[PDB]
Write a structure and sequence with these properties.
The structure is cut from a larger assembly and holds 2 copies of chain A and 2 copies of chain C (52 residues). By secondary structure, chain A is low in regular secondary structure. Chain A is 8% helix and 0% strand. Chain A has one helix spanning 29-32. Chain C is largely without helices or strands and 52 residues long. The chains are: A little secondary structure (51), C little secondary structure (52). The interface between C and D is medium-sized, with 18 and 18 residues. The PDB classes it as virus like particle.
């Protein structure tokens, strides 16, 4: 089985240290790390579950 | 062994447009009425006790 | 109907890799078809004439 | 006031759509595809044709 998709980031998400540019590829996560606006992450520190 | 590096893509498809507009809010925050002259005059009529 | 238009070409070549440097075009008008590739040339390796 | 701009006449830029002004192009058009012509065959009736 083969499945193909793009899976890009949304616009208004220029990569850091680049800013002004107009060919911005919103797929290369290595350069899009954190440089989004429409989603915000927040981790949570909790005590470990004993197994 | 013709791979996908031989065929060269043409015009990429335009899937989505993305405009940016604020949730403009002034119809609900204020009270509006169209004025027919360049000077708008409101009346404030107050009810006063004999001590004004 | 749009600025900066495009046009494609379809060079047809024979060989394991159609993009490697030096690949010979199949249906070339100036160059005769290699009428040994589908024949005896597939069975052995004919050396090419050179200097000396 | 928002000049249209132009491509820098660089095949690198023109295909990608990188412009100089505003409204970077979606991409080139598609004027068509040209492929090599098919050489014609010399009729085998000159020599013996004996279907086995």
């Amino acid at each position: 089985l083969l499945v193909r998709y793009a899976l890009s980031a949304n616009p208004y998400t220029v990569a850091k240290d680049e800013k002004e540019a107009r060919i911005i590829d919103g797929g290369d996560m290595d350069k899009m790390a954190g440089r989004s606006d429409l989603s915000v992450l927040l981790g949570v520190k909790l005590p470990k579950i004993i197994i | 062994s013709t791979t996908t590096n031989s065929n060269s893509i043409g015009r990429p498809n335009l899937v989505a447009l993305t405009r940016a507009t604020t949730k403009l809010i002034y119809s609900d925050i204020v009270a509006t009425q169209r004025t027919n002259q360049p000077v708008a005059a409101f009346y404030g009529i107050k009810y006063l006790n004999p001590d004004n | 109907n749009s600025p900066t238009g495009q046009v494609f070409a379809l060079r047809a070549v024979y060989g394991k890799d159609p993009v490697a440097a030096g690949a010979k075009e199949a249906f070339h008008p100036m160059y005769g078809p290699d009428a040994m590739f589908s024949g005896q040339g597939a069975a052995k390796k004919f050396p090419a004439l050179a200097a000396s | 006031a928002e000049i249209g701009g132009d491509h820098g006449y660089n095949a690198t830029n023109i295909a990608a759509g990188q412009t100089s002004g505003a409204v970077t192009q979606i991409g080139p058009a598609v004027m068509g595809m040209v492929r090599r012509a098919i050489p014609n065959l010399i009729a085998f009736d000159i020599c013996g044709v004996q279907p086995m």
